[PDB]
């Protein structure tokens, strides 16, 4: 029997089958309910925004409402993938430092509600490393809800060196929504944030030299690009293209006191052993949709070289498919024969219970 | 059938007998779907009570609400140690303060679970919301009963785009008749039921331009 | 005294003397104040022209109109990137965008490097005004006569006594009124007269045959 | 002396720097004939007098200028007619909304130097002026007028762009809602001449109840809150619960059908996203500003309502002159001797153009 | 009177000789564009790991100490500085150089922190386990003199424990990622943590009942509950692997320092193990140390762990007692002595 692979994100959920080079299904992690069907999941919830109140079960990478989470999986299995979970082993994912209770609950649901023959929970950042074909290296995983810098050593993360940064795609979307009012536009509603998101994903890019791009945008209109809204309207944006993702390197733009992703990566490396630091600098992997900004890789090395020893050779890895590298790593892992002895059988769960996740994973 | 956008169109067709049930169904729907400040009523109905007394309150909707709150000790239990300088009053505030905060609950069997602040409030409200027998609902809502039930009534498919279709003058005239129906609070359900029966029988022609023009055209011929 | 915002309330309290005089004043006002639907005219007189061809046309009122629209690139230029929903002439889009974003700000950069923001309506109004100042009087008269039925109705709806008429009485009653108003133009020769009669009869009833309250009362009276 | 012009979305205030009150207040409206041919335009009170003949248009909508022709006209009217002064002999301190589009700041500067050829001019954020009027340079300001309500935190007299949030809810919306709930009682205010009466009913009889539910129960059970008002024709109306129901829409925007939160929440939301180091100074300096904040017993409900949504461990400043505190702030500022250098001279504009405003202001 | 300045890797502790308490305690951190600098760190660690890394910063700290906290003229008071065990000669010299060429001290002395802590207990011989914020030390001492060959430094102290507690609290669902939320977790640590005598048995107890659980109210009014986190946190002192370190616990580090001494004096060190530093304040830490060192020592050996109730400031108290002696006024380093002998004199007078 073929194994399933489900990567649950704060904003988007990617599901498919192990062996495939990509997920077969990709939809927002949202649940809409009316004001007493009783629930809607996926794009269907967004199309019916007017009737429903939409909410996110995963927030900042952590599950916050298991009633809604249980529905996302029910939708993932029967609607999106169209399969029976009781005849498919499921490989799920989770964020670093995931609360133990959520580890248990994720297991409890898979066996009691869906009756999976077996399952496994992998760290997302660790899967991203597999997809890049490595066992050692540091992974910057930046999605919609949260950004993590996770150092890995021979397939194992280093819990003490992991740093969490609550600065991800959503914050950038909101930042773009706000700076666009400098040109005279008005994007405030929760429906408009979804519109401005698509503007961000398609027109934003990281500037290698920020102020040399500001001077350029000031001395010319060569950088200005146009976007047609869903209502047929059209808007042009200039420096807002690269000013938005700049918040990653300068959270002060969002009135945020946190450090930049460049410095957060450095700090994370500077919490490991002095010896291994080298392998990390040479294997800095970028994961998640919020690392898809053009020029982000060619910006990162410049930012960390100023922080790193000049003698050490730094190499940044930005796979062209780094938007699904987490799921891909899951596909690779769940397909290996040498991994088949690492699943959590129904037997092991019946014996030990939900707490089994802590020793197996 | 209540959520039929053309309810006013087919409502005059049905018999005197089926109208009596349609009017009651529509009536009960308004009271049940009507909204009220739950934080206020649960706080007033359990002030000075202990958590044990809350789990066995005379009001079933008060038990349902509290049962969902007590699952999470962190939201109400007082701390042994405090940062330097009623129980539900603490609970409701902690669930509002810790809006994004996670609370732990442990099942009868060892199983744990984490819920967000509002997910517990929403769960407690839903629990309560599915417990009242409408009469108790009418009693607690007695003040805003005509406003609240009307808000529900406007959202029905049969009322969508009524003011744009018949004008604001007619819409506010329907509101007046809706409010005017409530004489006493002891007969609120029977009152609004009769109002809905009389109007459903007439298909609300007494508030539509088409209906009034047909009425004067029907009247003059005598 | 045509512009009395509560005309329909006070007119029924008048004797048959000043009613007819009032109806004559109103009727004369509608025709004297009748203008043209610039949307269809400009859309038609530019239909099939590029932005360069719109400034080399024979008509001048159109060139003056377009000069105000082309200042704001976002109201007509095609976007580089488009949302996943954009199933979409040159003016037909301009007029639609300026109406879709009537309260949204468009940007224009003067011949010298200065910038300016302007809402869709102001732009759309500034273009119409430029057209009225650049059009020939006889050229206006010819196009007017083709459909004075709607023009006179437009003026009537634009009066204070008709401010938010549909808003207060509903679209179902608004169209009923428009139907009668148009029905008066059944004859071209006696058009100005048939409408004056239409106005007087309704001004006497205060248009109670089209308003909710007017109908509510009428029923209550006919019930007796 | 200098000129101080505070342009609002529904009211324009103007006068000389030094006076404790504006010499000229008038509606920010421009009237033009309803039809082509049966002067070309009017401004201010005159446009309102000839309401029947004219179609009125607001050049400032939600605090932002949307038509600069009409804006020029208001200023032209303000100078040559309302104040009877030559603008080329007086520096001009203007005022703008927070998060004002950048082009509007340039065009405002352009007009003052090219059209009116002023010796100099300065642009200040309205909320920041309200702060200065309170004899301060630090804190948060709630400026709610006719067209829009804002909440701006301030440090050293500098606004906090990232921290500022707005709300499309103000005095105009209240007047409209009051009309609605008065029809719910049994009346018919709809004409513009009736609107200005409901507006006066609002500015004279409305107040904010410290507990809305309690006030309503009293209104339904008792008749102690009823109050009689003489309609212009002599007719009397005995408005009751509408007194506090109307200003309630402020705290519960849902009364008007808006998803956004009230002002008590907007203030809390605004403060928290600032630097933690000064949040207790902001709480200790929460100023009320604008005509919509003139309701009696409103400052008490702010004090009351925040304590629920605040640390359980806050002085709210509601000066009696907070209807013109934006202008009064401008009078102080434009008269200070330690400010005469902050002005933008002719030369400074003739060299750098309108774009200079971004640095000086 | 004489000034006493205990320079900690987390907390500097100043005061006057004769008193039984510092009267001044503030974080040793300097921000750029004390406690005031910490509260405003959002808009703006010299002695990390116990040793001075930046001297400019230290000058600011010492400058801050005299005129603001103590409010005294450093030219009118002799200064007793404390020093980390195994402090390099260069640092000792520069410390003396600054005190004279910047503050013009009438005289100054540099005592070792562990030595003062021991002296406060009325001992000249013994071994001191000094555990602070940045670094922990085991310092064998014989007749007033520390024994460098037997001193063992361990980069594991209270700071690492705060971080560890902050981390394991996330297992329970809570979230302390913010910098401001750190000072809370530190307080929780100092109020609710304790050392388990038998760890495995305590985990078993914590997993079978809530008898060990305690509740803590946050500043925002919220309440969090912790169970086995109470002792798993300080347990990292005995099992640094919890922190992902290859080091060995304080119990083995103490033992190793003893075995690095001559066999002749070991019995005295075993019979006089003194605990020092704020990190040794955990309840049940002495009994544990007694248990663990007995488990390592020879069967016959006599063990006694001394845990002074005042051991949070035993370094400073020691310095206060030493700087108050009438027989100590002769062992100072006067101005003239530095002016002629140079910084190197410190090695011969201290
Ligand atoms: N091409 C792109 N360029 C820039 N940003 C993108 C692109 N594609 C997606 N994103 C952003 O990535 C985010 C979602 O990416 P991803 O699925 O990796 O995160 P997630 O797993 O949903 O959230 P998280 O993992 O943080 O809980 C969205 O906020 C989106 O705006
Ligand atoms: N005493 C009062 N009580 C209630 N409302 C008042 C009072 N005085 C003025 N208002 C309201 O305040 C509004 C005008 O205030 P103000 O001049 O501060 O607003 P503005 O600055 O013109 O608008 P903006 O919000 O764009 O600044 C009017 O809508 C008026 O109804
Ligand atoms: N009662 C207590 N329980 C637990 N920990 C405590 C207690 N009191 C203080 N601490 C901890 O002690 C540490 C600071 O102690 P101390 O000042 O002795 O060390 P230091 O001076 O920074 O370093 P050193 O003394 O090694 O130079 C802090 O990390 C603090 O959390
Ligand atoms: Ca992810
Ligand atoms: Ca204002
Ligand atoms: Ca110390």
mmCIF file of N, CA, C and O in Angstrom, chain E residues 263-335:
data_model
loop_
_atom_site.group_PDB
_atom_site.id
_atom_site.type_symbol
_atom_site.label_atom_id
_atom_site.label_comp_id
_atom_site.label_asym_id
_atom_site.label_seq_id
_atom_site.Cartn_x
_atom_site.Cartn_y
_atom_site.Cartn_z
ATOM 1 N N UNK E 263 46.284 13.934 47.891
ATOM 2 C CA UNK E 263 45.441 13.033 48.676
ATOM 3 C C UNK E 263 45.365 13.447 50.143
ATOM 4 O O UNK E 263 44.364 13.199 50.819
ATOM 5 N N UNK E 264 46.429 14.082 50.625
ATOM 6 C CA UNK E 264 46.534 14.455 52.029
ATOM 7 C C UNK E 264 45.416 15.396 52.472
ATOM 8 O O UNK E 264 44.894 15.262 53.579
ATOM 9 N N UNK E 265 45.044 16.337 51.608
ATOM 10 C CA UNK E 265 44.096 17.390 51.979
ATOM 11 C C UNK E 265 42.650 17.087 51.578
ATOM 12 O O UNK E 265 41.738 17.814 51.962
ATOM 13 N N UNK E 266 42.447 16.021 50.809
ATOM 14 C CA UNK E 266 41.128 15.704 50.263
ATOM 15 C C UNK E 266 40.051 15.511 51.330
ATOM 16 O O UNK E 266 38.910 15.935 51.141
ATOM 17 N N UNK E 267 40.402 14.871 52.441
ATOM 18 C CA UNK E 267 39.431 14.612 53.500
ATOM 19 C C UNK E 267 38.855 15.915 54.049
ATOM 20 O O UNK E 267 37.678 15.982 54.404
ATOM 21 N N UNK E 268 39.688 16.950 54.112
ATOM 22 C CA UNK E 268 39.246 18.260 54.575
ATOM 23 C C UNK E 268 38.279 18.883 53.578
ATOM 24 O O UNK E 268 37.273 19.479 53.964
ATOM 25 N N UNK E 269 38.588 18.739 52.293
ATOM 26 C CA UNK E 269 37.748 19.286 51.237
ATOM 27 C C UNK E 269 36.390 18.587 51.216
ATOM 28 O O UNK E 269 35.356 19.228 51.031
ATOM 29 N N UNK E 270 36.397 17.272 51.413
ATOM 30 C CA UNK E 270 35.158 16.508 51.486
ATOM 31 C C UNK E 270 34.324 16.939 52.690
ATOM 32 O O UNK E 270 33.096 16.958 52.633
ATOM 33 N N UNK E 271 35.003 17.289 53.779
ATOM 34 C CA UNK E 271 34.328 17.644 55.022
ATOM 35 C C UNK E 271 33.983 19.129 55.079
ATOM 36 O O UNK E 271 33.393 19.596 56.052
ATOM 37 N N UNK E 272 34.356 19.865 54.036
ATOM 38 C CA UNK E 272 34.094 21.299 53.975
ATOM 39 C C UNK E 272 33.759 21.757 52.560
ATOM 40 O O UNK E 272 34.438 22.617 51.996
ATOM 41 N N UNK E 273 32.710 21.166 51.993
ATOM 42 C CA UNK E 273 32.197 21.580 50.693
ATOM 43 C C UNK E 273 31.139 22.661 50.893
ATOM 44 O O UNK E 273 30.047 22.387 51.391
ATOM 45 N N UNK E 274 31.475 23.888 50.507
ATOM 46 C CA UNK E 274 30.585 25.032 50.688
ATOM 47 C C UNK E 274 29.925 25.415 49.367
ATOM 48 O O UNK E 274 30.587 25.489 48.332
ATOM 49 N N UNK E 275 28.617 25.659 49.414
ATOM 50 C CA UNK E 275 27.872 26.101 48.240
ATOM 51 C C UNK E 275 27.815 27.624 48.189
ATOM 52 O O UNK E 275 27.631 28.286 49.212
ATOM 53 N N UNK E 276 27.972 28.168 46.987
ATOM 54 C CA UNK E 276 28.020 29.610 46.784
ATOM 55 C C UNK E 276 27.288 29.994 45.506
ATOM 56 O O UNK E 276 27.260 29.227 44.544
ATOM 57 N N UNK E 277 26.689 31.182 45.506
ATOM 58 C CA UNK E 277 26.043 31.713 44.319
ATOM 59 C C UNK E 277 24.540 31.509 44.309
ATOM 60 O O UNK E 277 24.021 30.577 44.924
ATOM 61 N N UNK E 278 23.843 32.389 43.594
ATOM 62 C CA UNK E 278 22.392 32.375 43.545
ATOM 63 C C UNK E 278 21.815 31.091 42.984
ATOM 64 O O UNK E 278 20.682 30.728 43.290
ATOM 65 N N UNK E 279 22.599 30.396 42.169
ATOM 66 C CA UNK E 279 22.140 29.169 41.524
ATOM 67 C C UNK E 279 22.172 27.976 42.487
ATOM 68 O O UNK E 279 21.614 26.920 42.191
ATOM 69 N N UNK E 280 22.806 28.148 43.645
ATOM 70 C CA UNK E 280 22.835 27.093 44.658
ATOM 71 C C UNK E 280 21.744 27.305 45.706
ATOM 72 O O UNK E 280 21.791 26.714 46.787
ATOM 73 N N UNK E 281 20.765 28.145 45.382
ATOM 74 C CA UNK E 281 19.699 28.488 46.319
ATOM 75 C C UNK E 281 18.524 27.514 46.264
ATOM 76 O O UNK E 281 17.675 27.525 47.156
ATOM 77 N N UNK E 282 18.473 26.682 45.225
ATOM 78 C CA UNK E 282 17.368 25.741 45.050
ATOM 79 C C UNK E 282 17.180 24.871 46.289
ATOM 80 O O UNK E 282 18.150 24.346 46.826
ATOM 81 N N UNK E 283 15.930 24.723 46.758
ATOM 82 C CA UNK E 283 15.720 23.796 47.873
ATOM 83 C C UNK E 283 16.128 22.373 47.510
ATOM 84 O O UNK E 283 15.980 21.966 46.358
ATOM 85 N N UNK E 284 16.647 21.635 48.485
ATOM 86 C CA UNK E 284 17.010 20.245 48.278
ATOM 87 C C UNK E 284 18.259 20.031 47.441
ATOM 88 O O UNK E 284 18.507 18.918 46.974
ATOM 89 N N UNK E 285 19.051 21.083 47.247
ATOM 90 C CA UNK E 285 20.280 20.970 46.463
ATOM 91 C C UNK E 285 21.426 20.407 47.304
ATOM 92 O O UNK E 285 22.276 19.677 46.793
ATOM 93 N N UNK E 286 21.445 20.746 48.588
ATOM 94 C CA UNK E 286 22.497 20.280 49.485
ATOM 95 C C UNK E 286 22.385 18.779 49.718
ATOM 96 O O UNK E 286 23.372 18.053 49.608
ATOM 97 N N UNK E 287 21.180 18.321 50.046
ATOM 98 C CA UNK E 287 20.929 16.899 50.259
ATOM 99 C C UNK E 287 21.325 16.104 49.022
ATOM 100 O O UNK E 287 21.882 15.012 49.127
ATOM 101 N N UNK E 288 21.029 16.656 47.851
ATOM 102 C CA UNK E 288 21.379 16.003 46.597
ATOM 103 C C UNK E 288 22.893 15.915 46.438
ATOM 104 O O UNK E 288 23.428 14.855 46.118
ATOM 105 N N UNK E 289 23.572 17.038 46.655
ATOM 106 C CA UNK E 289 25.026 17.088 46.571
ATOM 107 C C UNK E 289 25.655 16.104 47.549
ATOM 108 O O UNK E 289 26.602 15.397 47.205
ATOM 109 N N UNK E 290 25.120 16.073 48.767
ATOM 110 C CA UNK E 290 25.546 15.121 49.785
ATOM 111 C C UNK E 290 25.431 13.697 49.248
ATOM 112 O O UNK E 290 26.346 12.887 49.399
ATOM 113 N N UNK E 291 24.300 13.403 48.617
ATOM 114 C CA UNK E 291 24.034 12.077 48.074
ATOM 115 C C UNK E 291 24.969 11.723 46.920
ATOM 116 O O UNK E 291 25.496 10.613 46.860
ATOM 117 N N UNK E 292 25.167 12.665 46.002
ATOM 118 C CA UNK E 292 25.921 12.394 44.782
ATOM 119 C C UNK E 292 27.424 12.293 45.040
ATOM 120 O O UNK E 292 28.109 11.466 44.438
ATOM 121 N N UNK E 293 27.935 13.139 45.929
ATOM 122 C CA UNK E 293 29.355 13.122 46.263
ATOM 123 C C UNK E 293 29.698 11.908 47.131
ATOM 124 O O UNK E 293 30.809 11.386 47.061
ATOM 125 N N UNK E 294 28.744 11.458 47.942
ATOM 126 C CA UNK E 294 28.930 10.237 48.716
ATOM 127 C C UNK E 294 29.002 9.046 47.767
ATOM 128 O O UNK E 294 29.755 8.100 47.995
ATOM 129 N N UNK E 295 28.218 9.106 46.697
ATOM 130 C CA UNK E 295 28.163 8.026 45.718
ATOM 131 C C UNK E 295 29.463 7.925 44.923
ATOM 132 O O UNK E 295 29.778 6.870 44.372
ATOM 133 N N UNK E 296 30.213 9.024 44.871
ATOM 134 C CA UNK E 296 31.467 9.072 44.120
ATOM 135 C C UNK E 296 32.685 8.851 45.011
ATOM 136 O O UNK E 296 33.678 8.268 44.578
ATOM 137 N N UNK E 297 32.605 9.318 46.251
ATOM 138 C CA UNK E 297 33.745 9.279 47.160
ATOM 139 C C UNK E 297 34.014 7.861 47.660
ATOM 140 O O UNK E 297 33.167 6.978 47.516
ATOM 141 N N UNK E 298 35.205 7.637 48.241
ATOM 142 C CA UNK E 298 35.484 6.344 48.876
ATOM 143 C C UNK E 298 34.507 6.084 50.018
ATOM 144 O O UNK E 298 34.050 7.037 50.647
ATOM 145 N N UNK E 299 34.197 4.815 50.274
ATOM 146 C CA UNK E 299 33.166 4.447 51.242
ATOM 147 C C UNK E 299 33.393 5.061 52.624
ATOM 148 O O UNK E 299 32.446 5.471 53.292
ATOM 149 N N UNK E 300 34.651 5.128 53.044
ATOM 150 C CA UNK E 300 34.985 5.609 54.379
ATOM 151 C C UNK E 300 34.882 7.125 54.498
ATOM 152 O O UNK E 300 34.701 7.656 55.593
ATOM 153 N N UNK E 301 34.998 7.815 53.367
ATOM 154 C CA UNK E 301 35.154 9.269 53.359
ATOM 155 C C UNK E 301 34.003 10.000 54.050
ATOM 156 O O UNK E 301 32.840 9.615 53.922
ATOM 157 N N UNK E 302 34.349 11.053 54.787
ATOM 158 C CA UNK E 302 33.371 11.878 55.491
ATOM 159 C C UNK E 302 32.968 13.085 54.644
ATOM 160 O O UNK E 302 33.807 13.912 54.287
ATOM 161 N N UNK E 303 31.679 13.177 54.327
ATOM 162 C CA UNK E 303 31.164 14.255 53.487
ATOM 163 C C UNK E 303 30.215 15.159 54.267
ATOM 164 O O UNK E 303 29.373 14.683 55.030
ATOM 165 N N UNK E 304 30.361 16.465 54.067
ATOM 166 C CA UNK E 304 29.398 17.431 54.581
ATOM 167 C C UNK E 304 29.271 18.631 53.646
ATOM 168 O O UNK E 304 30.256 19.308 53.341
ATOM 169 N N UNK E 305 28.044 18.881 53.196
ATOM 170 C CA UNK E 305 27.749 20.021 52.337
ATOM 171 C C UNK E 305 27.197 21.166 53.175
ATOM 172 O O UNK E 305 26.171 21.019 53.839
ATOM 173 N N UNK E 306 27.886 22.303 53.138
ATOM 174 C CA UNK E 306 27.458 23.492 53.863
ATOM 175 C C UNK E 306 26.756 24.445 52.901
ATOM 176 O O UNK E 306 27.329 24.857 51.892
ATOM 177 N N UNK E 307 25.511 24.787 53.222
ATOM 178 C CA UNK E 307 24.704 25.674 52.390
ATOM 179 C C UNK E 307 24.221 26.868 53.209
ATOM 180 O O UNK E 307 23.109 26.848 53.735
ATOM 181 N N UNK E 308 25.063 27.911 53.326
ATOM 182 C CA UNK E 308 24.700 29.101 54.106
ATOM 183 C C UNK E 308 23.400 29.731 53.606
ATOM 184 O O UNK E 308 23.228 29.861 52.396
ATOM 185 N N UNK E 309 22.487 30.103 54.519
ATOM 186 C CA UNK E 309 21.269 30.785 54.071
ATOM 187 C C UNK E 309 21.569 32.089 53.334
ATOM 188 O O UNK E 309 20.746 32.549 52.545
ATOM 189 N N UNK E 310 22.744 32.661 53.582
ATOM 190 C CA UNK E 310 23.133 33.935 52.981
ATOM 191 C C UNK E 310 24.068 33.738 51.793
ATOM 192 O O UNK E 310 24.806 34.650 51.423
ATOM 193 N N UNK E 311 24.032 32.552 51.191
ATOM 194 C CA UNK E 311 25.010 32.188 50.169
ATOM 195 C C UNK E 311 24.775 32.846 48.810
ATOM 196 O O UNK E 311 25.563 32.649 47.884
ATOM 197 N N UNK E 312 23.701 33.620 48.682
ATOM 198 C CA UNK E 312 23.452 34.348 47.442
ATOM 199 C C UNK E 312 24.450 35.494 47.302
ATOM 200 O O UNK E 312 24.802 35.890 46.190
ATOM 201 N N UNK E 313 24.907 36.015 48.440
ATOM 202 C CA UNK E 313 25.824 37.150 48.462
ATOM 203 C C UNK E 313 27.068 36.861 49.302
ATOM 204 O O UNK E 313 27.704 37.784 49.812
ATOM 205 N N UNK E 314 27.416 35.585 49.437
ATOM 206 C CA UNK E 314 28.553 35.189 50.266
ATOM 207 C C UNK E 314 29.872 35.743 49.734
ATOM 208 O O UNK E 314 30.812 35.960 50.500
ATOM 209 N N UNK E 315 29.943 35.969 48.425
ATOM 210 C CA UNK E 315 31.123 36.587 47.830
ATOM 211 C C UNK E 315 31.298 37.990 48.392
ATOM 212 O O UNK E 315 32.358 38.331 48.917
ATOM 213 N N UNK E 316 30.253 38.803 48.276
ATOM 214 C CA UNK E 316 30.313 40.183 48.737
ATOM 215 C C UNK E 316 30.483 40.259 50.251
ATOM 216 O O UNK E 316 31.279 41.057 50.749
ATOM 217 N N UNK E 317 29.722 39.444 50.977
ATOM 218 C CA UNK E 317 29.817 39.403 52.434
ATOM 219 C C UNK E 317 31.249 39.091 52.847
ATOM 220 O O UNK E 317 31.789 39.717 53.758
ATOM 221 N N UNK E 318 31.856 38.120 52.171
ATOM 222 C CA UNK E 318 33.247 37.784 52.407
ATOM 223 C C UNK E 318 34.138 38.994 52.211
ATOM 224 O O UNK E 318 35.008 39.277 53.036
ATOM 225 N N UNK E 319 33.910 39.713 51.117
ATOM 226 C CA UNK E 319 34.672 40.912 50.814
ATOM 227 C C UNK E 319 34.468 42.006 51.845
ATOM 228 O O UNK E 319 35.389 42.763 52.150
ATOM 229 N N UNK E 320 33.254 42.092 52.383
ATOM 230 C CA UNK E 320 32.937 43.090 53.397
ATOM 231 C C UNK E 320 33.660 42.783 54.702
ATOM 232 O O UNK E 320 34.176 43.684 55.363
ATOM 233 N N UNK E 321 33.694 41.506 55.069
ATOM 234 C CA UNK E 321 34.368 41.079 56.288
ATOM 235 C C UNK E 321 35.874 41.282 56.153
ATOM 236 O O UNK E 321 36.531 41.738 57.087
ATOM 237 N N UNK E 322 36.411 40.951 54.983
ATOM 238 C CA UNK E 322 37.847 41.054 54.742
ATOM 239 C C UNK E 322 38.302 42.508 54.682
ATOM 240 O O UNK E 322 39.412 42.835 55.100
ATOM 241 N N UNK E 323 37.441 43.378 54.163
ATOM 242 C CA UNK E 323 37.780 44.788 53.999
ATOM 243 C C UNK E 323 37.491 45.599 55.261
ATOM 244 O O UNK E 323 37.725 46.807 55.294
ATOM 245 N N UNK E 324 36.987 44.929 56.295
ATOM 246 C CA UNK E 324 36.652 45.588 57.554
ATOM 247 C C UNK E 324 37.675 45.264 58.639
ATOM 248 O O UNK E 324 37.634 45.836 59.728
ATOM 249 N N UNK E 325 38.590 44.346 58.339
ATOM 250 C CA UNK E 325 39.622 43.956 59.293
ATOM 251 C C UNK E 325 40.620 45.083 59.511
ATOM 252 O O UNK E 325 40.939 45.831 58.587
ATOM 253 N N UNK E 326 41.110 45.197 60.741
ATOM 254 C CA UNK E 326 42.117 46.195 61.077
ATOM 255 C C UNK E 326 43.496 45.739 60.613
ATOM 256 O O UNK E 326 44.394 46.556 60.414
ATOM 257 N N UNK E 327 43.654 44.430 60.441
ATOM 258 C CA UNK E 327 44.931 43.852 60.035
ATOM 259 C C UNK E 327 45.054 43.749 58.514
ATOM 260 O O UNK E 327 46.058 43.253 58.002
ATOM 261 N N UNK E 328 44.034 44.221 57.802
ATOM 262 C CA UNK E 328 44.006 44.141 56.344
ATOM 263 C C UNK E 328 44.410 45.462 55.692
ATOM 264 O O UNK E 328 44.796 45.494 54.523
ATOM 265 N N UNK E 329 44.334 46.550 56.454
ATOM 266 C CA UNK E 329 44.621 47.879 55.920
ATOM 267 C C UNK E 329 46.067 48.016 55.441
ATOM 268 O O UNK E 329 46.407 48.972 54.744
ATOM 269 N N UNK E 330 46.912 47.061 55.818
ATOM 270 C CA UNK E 330 48.326 47.099 55.461
ATOM 271 C C UNK E 330 48.614 46.342 54.166
ATOM 272 O O UNK E 330 49.678 46.510 53.570
ATOM 273 N N UNK E 331 47.666 45.515 53.733
ATOM 274 C CA UNK E 331 47.859 44.674 52.553
ATOM 275 C C UNK E 331 47.240 45.279 51.293
ATOM 276 O O UNK E 331 47.141 44.610 50.264
ATOM 277 N N UNK E 332 46.827 46.540 51.373
ATOM 278 C CA UNK E 332 46.305 47.244 50.207
ATOM 279 C C UNK E 332 47.424 47.536 49.211
ATOM 280 O O UNK E 332 48.604 47.388 49.531
ATOM 281 N N UNK E 333 47.041 47.954 48.006
ATOM 282 C CA UNK E 333 47.994 48.428 47.005
ATOM 283 C C UNK E 333 47.849 49.939 46.863
ATOM 284 O O UNK E 333 47.015 50.418 46.098
ATOM 285 N N UNK E 334 48.666 50.687 47.600
ATOM 286 C CA UNK E 334 48.587 52.145 47.594
ATOM 287 C C UNK E 334 48.909 52.713 46.214
ATOM 288 O O UNK E 334 49.407 52.002 45.341
ATOM 289 N N UNK E 335 48.617 53.997 46.026
ATOM 290 C CA UNK E 335 48.843 54.662 44.747
ATOM 291 C C UNK E 335 50.311 54.618 44.347
ATOM 292 O O UNK E 335 50.644 54.261 43.216
#
